[PDB]
């Protein structure tokens, strides 16, 4: 496979994709900000279990508009008024606007897009607005000793409103699964593994292995997750993993390394 390869500046070439790579990407970012549309575009080869996805959100008098799109063909990432589908609450952590109650309305520009609500703590914190991820209609999150991710998703007007989701205010499931992260050496080692109390709808015991895309090490995690969160696609973008294992189960402690 070969994909067009262009940096922010825009100098382009044909990248012979390395062994394993089978998808060509085009990440487009946009920033409207009081009368100036700012477009940056990266293209390159990219790893599998990736999907077309986009997120648009309002920071004060600005709009940030993320987009990525992929396909399997050779050089598939080559070349590529007022629309109104869904009213979605929006804000951001980049100006502590989501953290407060300054919750603007953002109209979805595409029929597929849905109202989102994410929270991301280790490794912006809070985000709200319009976007698309595959099979989205519904909520799905995860947490362990330190990390906490969540992503609600809905298709009706202003459905992503109300207070900001904090892990602390959520109840206890009763489910207890093991909490670790790292490599099976110094990381997810059996003494380094331990029991935590699951929360909210995250009542599945989860383990997920893979490889940290930035540096060629492998990497593992365990904790409490939703069923929908149990998914090969979703852990690979929350933690930049790929070539993944994702096991899930509903017995308190069926996580444990021994039980892999």
């Amino acid at each position: 496979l070969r994909c067009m390869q262009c940096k922010t500046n825009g100098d382009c070439r044909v990248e012979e994709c390395a062994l394993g790579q089978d998808l060509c990407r085009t990440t487009i970012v946009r920033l409207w900000e009081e009368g100036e549309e700012l477009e940056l575009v990266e293209k390159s080869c990219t790893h599998s279990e990736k999907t077309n996805r986009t997120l648009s959100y309002r920071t004060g008098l600005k709009i940030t508009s993320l987009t990525e799109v992929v396909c399997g063909l050779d050089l598939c990432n080559q070349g590529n008024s007022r629309s109104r589908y869904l009213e979605c609450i929006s804000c951001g952590s980049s100006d502590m606007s989501c953290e407060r109650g300054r919750h603007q309305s953002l109209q979805c520009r595409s029929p597929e897009e849905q109202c989102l609500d994410v929270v991301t703590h280790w490794i912006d914190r809070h985000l709200r607005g319009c976007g698309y991820l595959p099979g989205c209609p519904g909520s799905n999150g995860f947490h362990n000793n330190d990390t906490f991710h969540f992503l609600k998703c809905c298709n009706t007007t202003k459905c992503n409103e109300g207070p900001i989701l904090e892990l602390e205010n959520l109840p206890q499931n009763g489910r207890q699964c093991y909490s670790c992260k790292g490599n099976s050496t110094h990381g997810c080692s059996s003494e380094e593994t331990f029991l935590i109390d699951c929360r909210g709808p995250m009542n599945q015991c989860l383990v997920a292995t893979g490889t940290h895309e930035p540096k060629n090490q492998s990497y593992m995690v365990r904790g409490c997750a939703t069923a929908s969160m149990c998914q090969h696609a979703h852990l690979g973008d929350a933690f930049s993993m790929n070539h993944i294992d994702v096991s899930c189960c509903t017995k308190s402690g069926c996580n444990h390394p021994d039980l892999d």
Partner: antibody, heavy 122, light 108 residues
């Protein structure tokens, strides 16, 4: 209170132009597009076009190319629609409503003028 | 240009009877469809915005709902005041379009 006030009924010789108006009240005039809707006798509602005061920006249904022409005077909180080269079939009621420029669905097509009659005949 | 196919064009019913009318979009328009009510004197008022949201002061027997491409306005316990013309309006993408209207009748 919020209001959209419309010009009087017009009786017109075919081949003329007439300028209907929709005077706004109660709200920030520039924050909302003004929409023009035609309704012919015993016929249904059709969308003519729109214009955002106080901007140079307007849209229209393609069918009304050459017929409908939109302007607005912010001083007077007034929006206008000229219909040029009139025929029989321009005989209709013409309502104006508002469509908020921002996002906030509750403020779209929420309040309505009560219409202007235009009758064209020899 | 999107089109909306409204039905029924004409409908007769009695007091108490629940009724429903429907607009079908030729393309996806999200939840961005509104419903309109026109009085015999030509006066137009809005009842439902964004598919399901009720207008303020509108009596709660009126209600909105989508199913796929079919967005459906529903009245439960009819009143004499309700027997009038109704239209849907999509504002997803200009040129914006309307239904062909529905005339409501009292059954005698």
């Amino acid at each position: 209170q919020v209001q959209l006030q419309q010009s009087g009924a017009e009786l017109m010789k075919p081949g003329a132009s007439v300028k209907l108006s929709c005077k706004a009240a109660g709200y920030t005039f520039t924050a909302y597009w003004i929409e023009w809707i035609r309704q012919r006798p015993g016929h249904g509602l059709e969308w003519i076009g729109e214009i955002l005061p106080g901007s140079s920006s307007t849209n229209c249904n393609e069918m009304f190319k050459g017929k409908a022409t939109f302007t607005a005077d912010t001083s007077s909180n007034s929006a206008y629609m000229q219909l040029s080269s009139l025929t029989t079939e321009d005989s209709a009621i013409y309502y104006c409503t508002r469509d908020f420029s921002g996002d906030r669905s509750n403020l779209y097509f929420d309040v309505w003028g009560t219409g202007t009659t235009v009758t064209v005949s020899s | 240009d999107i089109q909306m196919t409204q039905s029924p064009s004409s409908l007769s019913a009695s007091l108490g009877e629940r009724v429903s009318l429907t607009c079908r979009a030729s393309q996806d328009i999200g939840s961005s469809l509104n419903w309109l009510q026109q009085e015999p004197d030509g006066t137009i008022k809005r009842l439902i915005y964004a598919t399901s949201s009720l207008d303020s002061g509108v009596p709660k027997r009126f209600s909105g709902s989508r199913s796929g491409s079919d967005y459906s306005l529903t009245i439960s316990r009819l009143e004499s005041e309700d027997f009038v013309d109704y239209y849907c309006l999509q504002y997803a993408t200009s040129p914006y379009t309307f239904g062909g209207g529905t005339k409501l009748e009292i059954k005698r």
